[PDB]
Design a protein around this nucleic acid. Structure first.
Lengths: 59, 154, 141, 117, 334, 58, 161, 23, 49, 166, 112, 70, 139, 142
RNA sequence: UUAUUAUAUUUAUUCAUUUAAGUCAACAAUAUCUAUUUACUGUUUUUGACAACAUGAUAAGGAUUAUAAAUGGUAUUGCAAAUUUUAUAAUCAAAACUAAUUUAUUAUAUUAAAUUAGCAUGUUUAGAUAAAACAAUAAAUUUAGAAGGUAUUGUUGCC
């Protein structure tokens, strides 16, 4: 409930003197794994190798 | 003996005094026990020393017996002659442990450290691979390599 | 506070004693370099005393028998090529693996500066009297 | 040019110890060695190894086709190989910020068992 | 069995059982000496099989001095009567001479000679079909597995001309060639050949898997050489199953029960006291047996080897309080 | 020993209600394997965070 | 380059001394120390040297007896059993009111090394050859050890009369 | 407290030779 | 010295640069190398300004 | 999500200290219990079976612990971005763990630790080449019998071994 | 012994299966990482003072890489270096200023 | 049937607890850190004997008792 | 301290022999402890790494899932990533799977389906008869 | 300091013979810059790799009017030794130049070239006290 | 030397480090009803915290108030709040010892990445001398309680 959460994030105001607080929210979230974008397809015929994973390979 | 570098000697009492720290180190007196045991030699002085320390270790915590004024002083004298005895008991054993071991190395052919004498095999002090020109005490220029006292084969 | 008291000037005209001294010292730097570099190299080409300590097994065994056999036959020419320095031989000897692990555990070896003595170092006075003109870090000879 | 003669002083940053020597030609096991040098007449050049891959380097998955080295089993091989000792100051990618063991910088004071959800 | 139980005490007895009944008895007092020894030399007579002369030369000596009685009357069936004999060496006509032939020689001639003897000494032991033969080796597990003697780098077979152009890393980096399987050891071949080769109900194997390995608990830095109990111990770290790693039948020997352990340690201290190797005059400072028995059972698990080491540690038992109480009880009666 | 009336006065106090518990080698004591004991203690330290609390339980 | 034939101020500095004291502060000249080892005094050098008896020696030793037991070479034992009988007799009870001298107080400070130096020197003079508080020799009646070597059991056939 | 009680005979007064250095 | 100390040889020595004295067996001095060093690559070959 | 309610609440440091405490919390711990994925799919195929999730774990070795794929996205400091980039790397991991739906070759190779040649089999190394050894040894001793006439000690390089001299 | 790690391509086996290296490849692709070609096999030293229970300071993670030659001028190190942006040094930049009341505001504005 | 006790020495540097139950089959054992008392204490007498005093001091027999120390 | 018989002799890397002039001679890193301490942590780790790798009686060999041993025919979570997985609770087989080794003679079926004369890889296992009479049974 | 050898004597206190952590000694005193260990002559006080690029001070970033002296981290090249022009390095008292060029200097940074602690000391720079202490030392005897 | 309580007591010693100045004031750019504010310009009279004098202020250092949870002090140690009346002296990369107030690694294995230490081998040997009673283990050659001062914060006192 978002109405409850905004009661929570308002606790930071009226806390006892010299006491900060931090919130650890942990909410389920529905995620779509649409195969259209990420296709579970066969290997590439030319398998990549370590030659494709030197430094700056991500770059 | 894997230790061969130069050494430093300390008098018997100054080692005997350490008691269970190094002198009566439990496993140490177990070492020189087996060594005595296996050689067919009776371990009489060790077990003689072992009870000396075991009682002292057990009673190192208590106070000394209350020193009430005794003009005779027999108690203070008995407090001394019984002590110097105990020292003399460990004196014999301390020397005894060094007696056999150096002689033992005469039987295993292990070259002892520097400035060390084995009764027959190294009559004077052996010194090999030191940090100086000469035999430290006999002023004899060392031979290179470290001279050997045993016969080559095993 | 020992209130920080000044040091006086560097002295008149000492700068000329500086530019001079630093320079012609850096010239001396060459010869001590040239001398020690040769001493290092020509040390590496010479033979050393054998690095092992004959006193301990398995090098007490007589030259005829024991690991001296493999030392004399399987690797003899090699141990002369490596010039008997205590770094390669203990690596060469470990490669032959026909003596097992007894290189490090059982076989005891001469101390460092006792093993840099060149061959035919009979007098033990030698190992300490290596020349002082050369700056090598006691690899020289 | 003469680098291949001079093995050590050219140790590029990407290079790493302990250096992998040149592989013995096919001395993968004793039969491979014995059949190659001691008994040439032996029929089994190499005993039948697994048809499927045999990664002896477990669990460190190493790049294939690279001449690779099994960790040294006998101590004598461990000490004598050229391994540097940590002469200079110690550095680590994460805790280089926290400069020393003594001065432990804390950008935010949080309980040392603060588990981010 | 478990490490350090009556593993080899069974064996030493088994030979004493054998040589009493006078049957020819081979005995390897230390199989460690072969598979874990001073050096390993390729057998000159035999291609691809190695020899260990330190134990072989001795083994030939002992097999002579041990069964010199029978081996004299034990005539040699199949071996050349033309082995190279030195000036003044008689021809072997009984095997006893053949073992004399090897070990009685001036090295390094012995090394090449013992390789031949160990090749032919078994040729008589195998050929025999009637004379009962018992083969004992304390430490068979070392014979089935590898040996820390590793094959030499092949460059030792190339007679390297020089170093820079040698293309050779024997000088630079010590790399590990595979270990030599003990079944390649010619003498162990002598045994191993008889194990597989059937139709030999004459030879018998009473063997003992030794387990004296350097104990490794999951982490072990440097040992403390000032006091290191296992420097002379063996270093295997290898789990061994006699089932899958041998042919002989498992005779699992276990730690003493409180019955046999009792009669042992009763002997171990009392007979020791009788020979003077015990407390003697200062016995009364030492505790009694029941305490000395009970306490050692605690610390030793009744393991016979551990019993010895713990028996040697009756010395430093600090928290015994029997005699100090008992003497105080005696003074009350007095 | 549990059932031994160590009592000098109250020898009518019963043995603990489990005086006949079965002693086996697997359960008690805890003599365990070394390398596995590493694998447990390590995996415990890393899996501290891997709590999935958003569940559909009751 | 071409190293100048005469160096201007390289050698023209002040002379540097070489240390001439073999020890602390470069002052201790060579002199016979307390650490000197009198090899003459007794079968061991006095003072004794640091001796470690590691477990490698014992286990190697235990193999050694496996030789002189079977090889019958009991002679090497016969040095020991006599070496023990002489050097292990019961140390006599010291008489009332006797003790080893301690460093006399007030002669030096408590921290001055002269405390231990005297104790070491006293313990040098009382070499085991001078150890009279312990009896030994031929005249001492040995009740514990057997007298003759043949009394040791390896000569059990001769012990059998 | 006295431990290792034994009844061997007494010694001779001054059984050790005096020190190397003294007053 | 760590690995290939023995690999070094007198062939590596630039002996012609300096001069040796037979009595001392050492290097008494060195000649000038800046003037007579004629090297086709003062800047390396692939370098083309 | 941590905002400040202390001396760091109001004045000019209101921003940069707030920016710090969020870029210091840029993580978004994406989690999902693998057993949840063992549902059917809109194509009708079973989504993730034992052959597939096996590939999943080995695809993210230290990540998938206690049976819950844990993906902590710490790349960007905009927390919503870490959700998008995090979910991005997430589906990619399922995109490959679903390969084991295709065929046997996509099934990962279970690691089996096989013993070294067991002693029973290591015995046969002894009797190996029975016919040849007896023949070659029978001769080598003859060449040996001749060899010891000439010299005192003979090497294996004399009889059989061929050290490459020249 | 020093060997050549074999990669039997999963196709040409009797019963095909994705080799473990293929997964190790397919992983590095997803989480962009660096596979080092010159990584040593013999160097599998684990940080024992941390990743072992019997030791005092058991943290379970490998804290320090036991590679002694590890420096900051290294390439692989700098790939994993933590930028000083928004760390202790930022806080010390703005909070540790000579007049701690100036970080709050300009003083003139306050006295205005 | 398990009783738990706590022990501390050197202030805090050492803390062990001793789960103890009655091993009815008389072959009980004292074990410590997944190893018999021997391996942890390296077969040392003067230490393994201290762990024994509480059993003998109370006149009891440890063969009945199964004690693990954590 | 650095007595060369310490730390398996590897202390020789950290020793400045002789009457060193503390100011000019003697390497710096040999002075500070944590560098000396971090170094010993390297070598001390090697012995463990050595001993852990001297007991490698097993050799790691991959295998397609279908013909693997029936012990590892389930999901196998990677090490240090779950509570140690006892092999089979119902079968009373409680042994860590990472610690269970399978014998080369047991698996010459797939691993050496190329065996031809299937014994040619290795002879079969001679399992001991645990039932018939033998010295153990007093017979 | 007791004797303010520069402007930074008035501020910082000796704090006794304080033991700084390794490699965190505050003043970068490279008094061990020139300690010639001939075997390590290419690894001592140099780039730990011989494939690094030269430091910045050997190069010119922009249009400089002119540097009074080039810094001491500069490495000496043949161009340095052959061009022969005045190359200056900062040192006490004023500056040091390499007037006599050589090729034995090529490849080593200027740190290893100069001698920091010049053996010839100044009886002029040191007051009667601090000179007296040198007299007792034997470095400046009398 | 007056009728619940112990000093005699090892384990140590060669140790140094500092650079090349720069404070005379404030200024939203997105999604709230529009300001070019876009590029908000007005010309100049002082000398403490300093390189100098400039009051305060917290430490080091054991010697006679625990038996059922404690062995480090105030007189004061560089930068501190009222005495000003020559003067910029502050860390920046690459840098040179004269300094009382300091564990340095001593012979199986020894430099891997921000730059880090080559001469001192000589019987763990002069004189001086350093530090423990605390989760460890030494419990006695021995203690309140009578005493003087030419000084007068008192023996480094005065005569």
């Amino acid at each position: 409930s978002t109405e409850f959460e905004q009661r929570m994030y308002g606790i930071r105001h009226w806390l006892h003197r010299q006491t900060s607080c931090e919130f650890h929210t942990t909410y389920r979230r529905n995620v779509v794994h649409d195969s259209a974008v990420f296709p579970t397809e066969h290997d590439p015929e030319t398998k990549p190798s370590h030659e494709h994973h030197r430094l700056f390979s991500f770059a | 003996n894997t230790y061969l570098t130069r050494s430093v000697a300390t008098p018997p009492i100054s080692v005997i005094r350490t008691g269970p720290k190094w002198w009566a180190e439990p496993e140490r007196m177990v070492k020189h026990k087996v060594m005595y045991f296996t050689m067919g030699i009776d371990q009489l002085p060790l077990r003689r020393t072992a009870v000396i320390q075991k009682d002292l270790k057990r009673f190192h915590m208590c106070k000394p017996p209350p020193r009430v004024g005794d003009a005779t002083g027999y108690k203070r004298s008995r407090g001394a002659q019984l002590t110097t005895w105990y020292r003399r008991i460990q004196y014999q054993e301390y020397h005894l442990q060094h007696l056999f071991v150096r002689h033992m190395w005469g039987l295993l052919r292990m070259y002892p450290g520097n400035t060390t004498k084995i009764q027959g095999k190294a009559d004077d002090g052996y010194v090999g691979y030191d940090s100086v020109h000469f035999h430290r005490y006999n002023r004899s220029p060392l031979p290179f390599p470290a001279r050997e006292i045993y016969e080559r084969r095993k | 506070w020992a209130k920080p008291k000044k040091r006086p000037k560097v002295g008149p005209g000492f700068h000329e004693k500086a530019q001079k001294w630093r320079d012609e010292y850096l010239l001396d730097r060459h010869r001590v370099l040239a001398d020690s570099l040769r001493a290092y190299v020509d040390f590496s080409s010479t033979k050393r005393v054998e690095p092992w300590d004959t006193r301990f097994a398995p090098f007490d065994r007589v030259e005829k028998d024991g690991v001296y056999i493999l030392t004399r036959y399987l690797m003899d020419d090699k141990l002369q090529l490596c010039n008997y320095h205590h770094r390669p031989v203990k690596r060469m000897l470990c490669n032959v693996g026909l003596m097992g692990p007894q290189v490090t555990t059982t076989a005891r070896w001469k101390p460092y500066r006792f093993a840099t003595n060149p061959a035919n170092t009979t007098r033990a006075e030698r190992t300490f009297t290596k020349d002082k003109t050369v700056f090598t870090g006691y690899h020289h000879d | 040019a003469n680098a291949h003669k001079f093995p050590h002083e050219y140790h590029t940053p990407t290079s790493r110890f302990p250096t992998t020597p040149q592989q013995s030609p096919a001395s993968d096991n004793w039969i491979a060695y014995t059949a190659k040098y001691l008994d040439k007449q032996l029929a089994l050049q190499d005993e039948p190894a697994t048809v499927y891959n045999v990664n002896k380097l477990w669990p460190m998955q190493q790049v294939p086709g690279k001449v690779d080295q099994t960790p040294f089993e006998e101590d004598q091989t461990w000490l004598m190989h050229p391994i540097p000792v940590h002469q200079m100051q110690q550095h680590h990618p994460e805790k280089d910020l926290q400069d020393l063991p003594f001065v432990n910088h804390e950008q935010f004071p949080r309980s040392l068992e603060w588990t981010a959800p | 069995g478990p490490t350090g139980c009556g593993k080899s005490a069974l064996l030493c007895q088994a030979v004493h059982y054998a040589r009493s009944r006078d049957i020819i008895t081979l005995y390897i007092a230390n199989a460690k000496a072969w598979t874990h020894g001073e050096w390993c030399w390729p057998s000159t007579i035999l291609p691809g099989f190695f020899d260990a002369p330190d134990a072989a030369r001795e083994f030939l000596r002992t097999v002579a001095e041990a069964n010199g009685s029978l081996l004299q009357a034990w005539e040699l069936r199949v071996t050349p009567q033309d082995l190279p004999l030195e000036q003044g060496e008689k021809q072997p006509r009984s095997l006893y001479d053949l073992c004399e032939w090897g070990h009685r020689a001036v090295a390094p001639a012995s090394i090449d000679r013992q390789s031949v003897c160990i090749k032919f000494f078994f040729d008589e032991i195998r050929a025999e079909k009637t004379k009962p033969i018992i083969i004992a080796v304390d430490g068979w597990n070392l014979f089935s597995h590898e040996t820390h003697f590793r094959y030499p780098h092949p460059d030792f077979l190339r007679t390297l001309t020089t170093l820079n152009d040698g293309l050779t890393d024997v000088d630079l980096y010590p790399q590990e060639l595979p270990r030599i399987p003990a079944s390649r050891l010619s003498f162990v071949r002598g045994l191993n050949k008889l194990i597989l080769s059937k139709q030999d109900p004459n030879k018998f194997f009473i063997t003992c898997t030794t387990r004296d390995f350097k104990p490794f608990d999951g982490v072990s830095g440097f040992a403390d050489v000032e006091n290191d109990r296992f420097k002379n111990s063996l270093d295997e770290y290898a789990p061994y199953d006699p089932e899958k790693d041998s042919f002989f039948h498992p005779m699992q020997v276990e730690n003493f029960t409180e019955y046999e352990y009792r009669a042992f340690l009763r002997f171990a201290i009392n007979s020791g006291e009788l020979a003077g190797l015990g407390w003697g005059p200062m016995w009364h400072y030492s505790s009694d047996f029941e305490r000395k028995l009970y306490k050692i059972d605690f610390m030793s698990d009744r393991n016979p080897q551990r019993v010895v080491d713990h028996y040697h540690q009756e010395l430093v038992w600090r928290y015994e309080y029997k005699r100090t109480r008992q003497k105080q009880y005696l003074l009350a009666r007095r | 020993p549990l059932e031994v009336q160590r009592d000098v006065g109250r020898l009518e106090e019963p043995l603990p209600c489990a005086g006949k518990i079965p002693a086996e080698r697997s359960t008690f004591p805890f003599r365990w394997n070394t390398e596995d004991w590493y694998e447990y203690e390590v995996a415990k330290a890393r899996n501290k965070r891997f709590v999935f609390e958003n569940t559909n339980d009751n | 380059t071409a190293t100048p034939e005469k160096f201007s101020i390289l050698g023209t500095t002040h002379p540097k001394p070489k240390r001439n004291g073999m020890g602390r502060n470069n002052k201790m000249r060579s002199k016979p120390s307390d650490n000197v080892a009198w090899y003459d005094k007794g079968p061991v050098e006095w003072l004794p040297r640091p001796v470690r008896l590691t477990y490698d020696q014992l286990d190697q030793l235990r193999d050694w007896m496996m030789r002189e037991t079977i090889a019958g070479r009991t002679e090497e034992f016969n040095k020991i059993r006599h070496l023990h009988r002489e050097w292990s007799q019961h140390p006599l009870m010291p008489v009332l009111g006797d003790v080893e001298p301690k460093f006399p107080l007030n002669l030096y400070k408590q921290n001055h090394r002269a405390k231990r130096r005297f104790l070491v020197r006293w313990h040098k003079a009382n070499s085991p050859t001078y150890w009279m508080w312990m009896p030994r020799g031929p005249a001492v009646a040995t009740p514990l050890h057997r007298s003759s070597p043949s009394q040791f059991p390896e000569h059990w056939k001769s012990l059998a009369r | 407290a006295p431990s290792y009680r034994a009844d061997v005979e007494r010694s001779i007064k001054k059984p050790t030779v005096p020190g190397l250095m003294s007053t | 010295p760590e690995v290939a100390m023995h690999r070094n040889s007198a062939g590596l020595l630039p002996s012609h640069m300096w001069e040796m004295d037979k009595k001392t067996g050492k290097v008494r001095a060195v000649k000038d190398s800046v003037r007579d060093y004629q090297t086709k690559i003062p800047v390396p070959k692939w370098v083309q300004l | 999500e941590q905002y400040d309610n202390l001396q760091y609440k109001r004045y000019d440091w209101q921003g940069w200290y707030q920016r710090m405490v969020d870029v210091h919390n840029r993580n978004v711990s994406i989690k999902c219990r693998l057993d949840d994925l063992k549902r059917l799919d809109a194509y009708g195929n079973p989504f993730v079976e034992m052959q597939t999730e096996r590939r999943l774990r080995i695809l993210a070795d230290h990540r998938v612990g206690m049976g819950v794929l844990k993906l902590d996205s710490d790349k960007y400091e905009d927390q919503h971005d870490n959700i998008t980039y995090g979910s991005t790397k997430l589906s990619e991991l399922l995109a490959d763990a679903r390969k084991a739906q295709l065929g046997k070759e996509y099934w990962p190779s279970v690691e089996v630790k096989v013993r070294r040649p067991s002693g029973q089999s290591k015995a046969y190394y002894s009797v190996l080449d029975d016919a040849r050894i007896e023949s070659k040894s029978k001769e080598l001793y003859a060449k040996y019998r001749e060899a010891k006439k000439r010299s005192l000690f003979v090497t294996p390089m004399d009889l059989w071994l061929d050290v490459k001299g020249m | 012994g020093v060997h050549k790690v074999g990669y039997t391509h999963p196709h040409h086996l009797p019963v095909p299966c994705a080799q473990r290296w293929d997964l190790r490849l397919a992983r590095a692709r997803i989480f962009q990482e660096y596979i080092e070609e010159k990584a040593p096999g013999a160097w599998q030293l684990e940080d024992e003072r941390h990743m072992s229970p019997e030791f005092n300071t058991f943290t379970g993670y490998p804290m320090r890489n036991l590679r002694p030659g590890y420096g900051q001028n290294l390439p692989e190190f700098i790939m994993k270096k933590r930028l000083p942006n928004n760390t202790h040094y930022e806080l010390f930049a703005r909070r540790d200023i000579p007049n701690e009341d100036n970080a709050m505001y300009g003083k003139l504005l306050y006295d205005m | 049937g398990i009783a738990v006790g706590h022990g501390r020495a050197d202030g805090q540097k050492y803390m062990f607890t001793a789960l103890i139950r009655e091993n009815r089959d008389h072959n009980g054992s004292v074990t410590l850190l997944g190893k018999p008392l021997s391996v942890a204490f390296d077969d040392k007498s003067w230490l393994m004997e201290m762990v024994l005093m509480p059993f003998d001091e109370a006149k009891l027999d440890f063969r009945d008792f199964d004690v693990n120390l954590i | 301290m650095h007595d060369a018989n310490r730390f398996g002799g590897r202390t020789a890397y950290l020793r400045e022999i002789g009457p060193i002039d503390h100011k000019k001679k003697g390497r710096l890193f040999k002075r500070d402890l944590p560098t000396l301490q971090f170094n010993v942590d390297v070598w001390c780790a090697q012995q463990t790494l050595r001993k852990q790798w001297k007991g490698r009686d097993w050799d790691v060999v991959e295998m397609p899932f279908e013909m693997a041993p029936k012990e590892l025919q389930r999901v196998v979570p990677e090490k240090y990533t779950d509570v140690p997985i006892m092999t089979d609770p119902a079968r009373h087989d409680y042994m860590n799977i990472r610690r269970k080794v399978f014998d080369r003679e047991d698996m010459q079926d797939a691993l050496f389906a190329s065996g031809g004369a299937g014994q040619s890889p290795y002879p079969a296992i001679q399992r001991v008869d645990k039932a018939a009479m033998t010295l153990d049974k007093y017979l | 300091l007791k004797i303010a050898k520069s402007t930074f004597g008035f501020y910082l206190a000796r704090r006794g013979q304080r033991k700084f952590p390794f490699h965190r000694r505050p003043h970068i005193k490279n008094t061990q810059a020139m300690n010639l260990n001939a075997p390590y002559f290419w690894s001592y006080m140099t780039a730990k790799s011989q494939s690094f690029f030269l430091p910045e001070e050997n190069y010119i970033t922009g249009d400089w009017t002119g540097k009074f002296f080039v810094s001491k981290r500069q490495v000496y090249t043949l161009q340095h030794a052959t061009s022969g022009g005045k190359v200056r390095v900062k040192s006490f008292p004023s500056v040091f130049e390499l007037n006599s060029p050589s090729r034995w200097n090529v490849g080593k940074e200027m740190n290893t070239l100069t001698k920091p602690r010049m053996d010839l000391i100044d009886d002029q720079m040191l007051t009667k006290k601090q000179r007296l202490d040198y007299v007792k030392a034997g470095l400046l005897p009398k």
